[PDB]
Enzyme design. Structure first.
Site, PDB file in Angstrom:
ATOM      1  N   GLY A  45      -5.268  -3.761  13.191  1.00  0.00           N
ATOM      2  CA  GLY A  45      -4.355  -4.885  13.265  1.00  0.00           C
ATOM      3  C   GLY A  45      -2.927  -4.380  13.261  1.00  0.00           C
ATOM      4  NE  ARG A  46       0.410  -6.423  18.219  1.00  0.00           N
ATOM      5  CZ  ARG A  46       1.143  -7.515  18.012  1.00  0.00           C
ATOM      6  NH1 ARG A  46       1.895  -7.618  16.923  1.00  0.00           N
ATOM      7  NH2 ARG A  46       1.127  -8.505  18.894  1.00  0.00           N
ATOM      8  CE  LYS A  48      10.631  -9.156  11.569  1.00  0.00           C
ATOM      9  NZ  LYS A  48      10.559  -9.835  12.896  1.00  0.00           N
ATOM     10  CB  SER A  50       2.777  -1.154   9.374  1.00  0.00           C
ATOM     11  OG  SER A  50       1.936  -2.107   8.740  1.00  0.00           O
ATOM     12  CE  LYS A  67       1.258  -1.361   5.321  1.00  0.00           C
ATOM     13  NZ  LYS A  67       1.234  -2.028   3.994  1.00  0.00           N
ATOM     14  CG  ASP A 155       1.364 -11.043   1.782  1.00  0.00           C
ATOM     15  OD1 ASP A 155       1.304 -12.274   2.002  1.00  0.00           O
ATOM     16  OD2 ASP A 155       1.394 -10.212   2.706  1.00  0.00           O
TER      17      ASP A 155
HETATM   18  C1  LIG Z   1      -4.230  -4.527   9.050  1.00  0.00           C
HETATM   19  C2  LIG Z   1      -5.320  -5.082   8.130  1.00  0.00           C
HETATM   20  C3  LIG Z   1      -4.779  -5.904   6.949  1.00  0.00           C
HETATM   21  N1  LIG Z   1      -6.353  -5.780   8.881  1.00  0.00           N
HETATM   22  C4  LIG Z   1      -7.610  -5.271   9.021  1.00  0.00           C
HETATM   23  C5  LIG Z   1      -8.418  -5.784  10.070  1.00  0.00           C
HETATM   24  C6  LIG Z   1      -9.727  -5.298  10.257  1.00  0.00           C
HETATM   25  C7  LIG Z   1     -10.156  -4.317   9.364  1.00  0.00           C
HETATM   26  C8  LIG Z   1     -11.368  -3.615   9.237  1.00  0.00           C
HETATM   27  N2  LIG Z   1     -11.268  -2.801   8.174  1.00  0.00           N
HETATM   28  N3  LIG Z   1     -10.142  -2.860   7.649  1.00  0.00           N
HETATM   29  C9  LIG Z   1      -9.815  -2.085   6.578  1.00  0.00           C
HETATM   30  C10 LIG Z   1     -10.819  -1.344   5.893  1.00  0.00           C
HETATM   31  N4  LIG Z   1     -10.506  -0.563   4.840  1.00  0.00           N
HETATM   32  C11 LIG Z   1      -9.254  -0.487   4.415  1.00  0.00           C
HETATM   33  C12 LIG Z   1      -8.256  -1.230   5.097  1.00  0.00           C
HETATM   34  N5  LIG Z   1      -6.989  -1.167   4.666  1.00  0.00           N
HETATM   35  C13 LIG Z   1      -6.379  -0.436   3.556  1.00  0.00           C
HETATM   36  C14 LIG Z   1      -4.990  -0.569   3.462  1.00  0.00           C
HETATM   37  C15 LIG Z   1      -4.619  -1.420   4.525  1.00  0.00           C
HETATM   38  C16 LIG Z   1      -3.244  -1.868   4.960  1.00  0.00           C
HETATM   39  C17 LIG Z   1      -2.288  -2.167   3.815  1.00  0.00           C
HETATM   40  O1  LIG Z   1      -2.519  -1.733   2.660  1.00  0.00           O
HETATM   41  O2  LIG Z   1      -1.305  -2.839   4.133  1.00  0.00           O
HETATM   42  C18 LIG Z   1      -5.776  -1.773   5.171  1.00  0.00           C
HETATM   43  N6  LIG Z   1      -8.534  -1.995   6.149  1.00  0.00           N
HETATM   44  C19 LIG Z   1      -9.405  -3.782   8.317  1.00  0.00           C
HETATM   45  C20 LIG Z   1      -8.093  -4.257   8.128  1.00  0.00           C
END
Ligand SMILES: CC(C)Nc1ccc2cnn(-c3cncc(-n4ccc(CC(=O)O)c4)n3)c2c1
Length: 331
Positions: A45-46, A48, A50, A67, A155
């Site tokens: 995902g993306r 504003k 990151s 990230k 959030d």
């Molecule tokens: C971009 C994200 C929220 N969306 C998303 C969509 C599909 C998926 C599938 N798995 N997954 C995912 C799985 N494990 C850890 C993280 N993660 C750990 C830190 C962060 C990012 C952070 O800490 O901001 C994200 N994200 C997704 C995550």
């Protein structure tokens, strides 16, 4: 006639008594890992701030999530990093595994542990009454932990909650808007995501605290037991409060602004109207009845309250009858 000051009813002076370095992220010096140990595999995902991808650690074939940050301010970077390190190892707190300099983006990329997540939009349609109670308890552990450590997530929403369902594993992510709590401090109300914004944010009362997360948690719960995500669907920040008023009623909303002597943006005058507070039973139907119980409504009701001070804290919420069963750890 300025607003009336406010303080969190719990974990009020946790940072007050800790080493300055604990909460002073501006002076924090980031130590970097090796960007060469990670290879991107898929975009998750993306935003504003990151773009997030699934990745692999070329060193041990371990799956990870990267990230990659957008330019935002050194101060902003250190804050998220310090909060993640300060919270690491905490219950259901996502684990920051590494910090590296993305050569392509020229920005910092945060490396977290990976969770075999199931898109919440699909998962929620499958959740049982017990699942909900269970995962809500897991989220409370996280909130109580970070709050007890003097940190506000800011959030809380389904998107920042990764769930490996078959393993009943949950991690709270995206601490990019997280901040330390200092009593008397007036914060930026531009936090959380529209649908999970508490009335304090919506009416512009800056002296808020951890209780903000509890309202956000209430929104998730309502959306879960009623099968309506998001529960409060505002068209914008103003209409958002209107949607809430149309449920909680306008009397209690106004009683709230009077208590803290808040001056409502005139723009509200022509949109709030007059609304009776509805019964939580009004959102029950043949499709979600199986997820609604007296305890669930009583609990929801004690989270979704205008007055942030009267909202249940994370530690108090964990003591609600709604959670008696949640196969208590023990063994
Ligand atoms: C971009 C994200 C929220 N969306 C998303 C969509 C599909 C998926 C599938 N798995 N997954 C995912 C799985 N494990 C850890 C993280 N993660 C750990 C830190 C962060 C990012 C952070 O800490 O901001 C994200 N994200 C997704 C995550």
């Amino acid at each position: 006639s300025g607003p009336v000051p406010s303080r969190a009813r719990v974990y009020t002076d946790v940072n007050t008594h800790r080493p300055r370095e604990y909460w002073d992220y501006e002076s924090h010096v980031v130590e970097w890992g090796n960007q060469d140990d990670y290879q991107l595999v898929r975009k998750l995902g993306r935003g504003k701030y990151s773009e997030v991808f699934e990745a692999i650690n070329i060193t041990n074939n371990e799956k990870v999530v990267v990230k990659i940050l957008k330019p935002v301010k050194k101060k902003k970077i250190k804050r998220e990093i310090k909060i993640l390190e300060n919270l690491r190892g905490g219950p259901n707190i996502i684990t920051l595994a590494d910090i590296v300099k993305d050569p392509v983006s020229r920005t910092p990329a945060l490396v977290f542990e990976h969770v075999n997540n199931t898109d919440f939009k699909q998962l929620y349609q499958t959740l049982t009454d017990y699942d909900i109670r269970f995962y809500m308890y897991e989220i409370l552990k996280a909130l109580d932990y970070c709050h007890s450590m003097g940190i506000m997530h800011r959030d809380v929403k389904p998107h920042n909650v990764m769930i490996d369902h078959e393993h009943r594993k949950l991690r709270l992510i995206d601490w990019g808007l997280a901040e330390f709590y200092h009593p008397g401090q007036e914060y930026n109300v531009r936090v959380a995501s529209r649908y999970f914004k508490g009335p304090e944010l919506l009416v512009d009362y800056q002296m808020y605290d951890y209780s903000l997360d509890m309202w956000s948690l209430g929104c998730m719960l309502a959306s879960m037991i009623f099968r309506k995500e998001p529960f409060f669907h505002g068209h914008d920040n103003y209409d958002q409060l209107v949607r809430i008023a149309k449920v909680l009623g306008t009397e209690d909303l106004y009683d709230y602004i009077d208590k803290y002597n808040i001056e409502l943006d005139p723009r509200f005058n022509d949109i709030l109207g007059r609304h009776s507070r509805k019964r939580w039973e009004r959102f029950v139907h043949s499709e979600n009845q199986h997820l609604v119980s007296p305890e669930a409504l009583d609990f929801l009701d004690k989270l979704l309250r205008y007055d942030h001070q009267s909202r249940l804290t994370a530690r108090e919420a964990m003591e609600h009858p709604y959670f008696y069963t949640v196969v208590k750890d023990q063994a």
